[PDB]
């Protein structure tokens, strides 16, 4: 109804097929940290606030909310008639239950730190085993009023609440079934869809959740998510007419021709994302700053963005995208403005000083998730690091399936890993928070108490300028330590069939909510 322009002739079936790119780790939002996982979670569950086709915030499970003028108390007014898919009522108790479970050490959640980022009273103490989960600073004031108590001002709090990690869970179900609640037979959610089927490595089928509070505005009746790893295979299925929307990678070598032949089907979203090679800071020899610096100097970003990809990705030398809100004072480092000849000279010296030569080069593997585009970037990186250092680096490639790749990065079983970080919310700390010493997201094992202190100063600021200065200083410190190898800021290219509507190409987080889409007839 409302999302559909008047007069628009809708197709009768309303089925859509989307490539989700990989088999998700889990459908439990406390056990996951990836885009494939969040894409599934967002169809089955809905948090306090959610977003439209352009990423603008809109009421979710909460119909209204407010904050105290100090930005420390956040009150959410929940819908009195909203239900779980089994008929249970959705209440503030479910949010209290879910947010406690997220920080509870027993959950071992990859995103435990998220409530620490939000500065929720006692979140960090709970993660650290010093306080019980019941001591977390959130409460059901009554069944339909959920209150969040932050120890520091967090003016961007509402945007943080759209993240998968803060989705509610059906307390009554999870308390009874444990971790097994996530099985298809048991899953209960408050989102627009429910799980109709799941075949590992093949497909996830979604069906309408008729008990969704806003089911009357949902148009798509059913959807399939595929798990096609390689952009070229994604495009081949699309052109065979067997899927309707690709994942957010397209083959660089096909890109020009696809724009020519598929007019109005090629979308490119400019997103708040950074593609990096993460260095394992606690594994020899990347514990050596001199070697981390050599790798940064000797990698020519323009080769990757202009010659390997060429889809609008832009080179970067910092973790935070500088165009994110409050990111504007972050500076690209000085070396980024030196000619490659100078950079390569400096890198070779550093590597010789560290005992490498053509006969005894620095050897390591780039770990990446199986994907032909990542392979291309890794080959170009391998090739550049060898030639630019005159044979002093010799790089192997190792691809793993998504789930294995995530496990390997979290377990520290890597030298150098391909890493993409997409904003959890449209403000700088979604990047800055990543490299805090104690962040559950910090798989790099980067730890500088001076980085942590610079970030901490942001909460003492009283305005966006004060915050932006603190974030600039944090990034400067991360830059001087060469903690990682930033490569580019993302663009998200997709093919979308012309009968698919409600995909904007303008959402800086490029979410796809099935409830935002519709299939037209003509």
């Amino acid at each position: 109804m409302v999302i559909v322009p008047e007069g628009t002739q809708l197709d009768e079936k309303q089925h859509i097929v989307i490539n989700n790119g990989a088999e998700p780790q889990s459908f439990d939002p406390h056990k996951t940290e990836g885009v494939p996982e969040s894409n599934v979670a967002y169809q089955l569950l809905e948090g306090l606030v959610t977003s439209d086709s352009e990423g603008k915030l809109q009421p979710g499970a909460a119909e209204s909310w407010e904050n105290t003028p100090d930005f420390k108390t956040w009150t959410f007014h929940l819908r009195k008639d909203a239900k779980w898919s089994n008929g249970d009522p959705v209440t503030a108790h479910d949010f209290v239950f879910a947010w406690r479970r997220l920080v509870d050490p027993a959950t071992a959640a990859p995103y435990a730190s998220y409530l620490s980022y939000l500065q929720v009273e006692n979140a960090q103490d709970i993660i650290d085993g010093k306080k019980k989960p019941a001591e977390l600073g959130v409460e059901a004031k009554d069944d339909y009023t959920f209150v969040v108590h932050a120890t520091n001002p967090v003016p961007y709090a509402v945007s943080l609440t759209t993240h998968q990690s803060l989705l509610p869970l059906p307390q009554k179900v999870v308390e009874k079934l444990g971790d097994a609640w996530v099985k298809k037979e048991n899953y209960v959610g408050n989102g627009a869809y429910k799980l109709a089927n799941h075949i590992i490595n093949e497909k996830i089928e979604f069906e309408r959740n008729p008990l969704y509070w806003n089911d009357k505005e949902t148009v798509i009746n059913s959807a399939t998510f595929l798990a096609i790893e390689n952009p070229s295979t994604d495009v081949a299925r699309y052109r065979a007419g067997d899927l309707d929307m690709t994942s957010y990678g397209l083959p660089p070598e096909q890109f020009a021709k696809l724009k020519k032949e598929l007019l109005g089907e090629v979308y490119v979203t400019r997103t708040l994302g950074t593609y990096s090679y993460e260095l394992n800071n606690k594994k020899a020899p990347f514990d050596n700053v001199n070697i981390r610096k050599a790798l940064n100097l000797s990698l020519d970003r323009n080769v990757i963005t202009d010659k390997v990809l060429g889809q609008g990705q832009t080179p970067t030398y910092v973790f935070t995208p500088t165009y994110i809100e409050e990111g504007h004072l972050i500076q690209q480092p000085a070396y980024s403005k030196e000619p490659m000849a100078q950079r390569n000279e400096e890198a070779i010296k550093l590597l010789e000083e560290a005992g490498y030569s053509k006969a005894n080069p620095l050897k390591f593997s780039i770990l990446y998730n199986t994907n032909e585009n990542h392979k291309k970037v890794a080959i170009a990186a391998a090739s550049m690091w060898k030639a630019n250092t005159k044979g002093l680096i010799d790089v192997k490639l190792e691809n793993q399936e998504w789930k294995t790749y995530i496990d390997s990065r979290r377990a520290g079983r890597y030298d150098v890993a391909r890493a993409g970080w997409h904003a959890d919310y449209n403000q700088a700390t979604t990047f800055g928070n990543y490299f805090l010493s104690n962040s559950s997201n910090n798989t790099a094992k980067y730890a500088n108490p001076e980085y942590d202190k610079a970030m901490a100063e942001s909460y003492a600021a009283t305005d966006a300028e004060g915050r932006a200065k603190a974030y600039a200083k944090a990034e400067e410190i991360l830059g001087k330590d060469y903690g990682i190898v930033p490569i580019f800021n993302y663009v998200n290219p997709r093919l979308v069939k012309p009968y698919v509507k409600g995909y904007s190409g303008k959402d800086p987080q490029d979410h796809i909510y099935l409830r935002n889409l519709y299939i037209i007839k003509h």
Partner: peptide, 6 residues
Amino acid sequence: YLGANG
């Protein structure tokens, strides 16, 4: 969020 693609 960790990104699958690029």
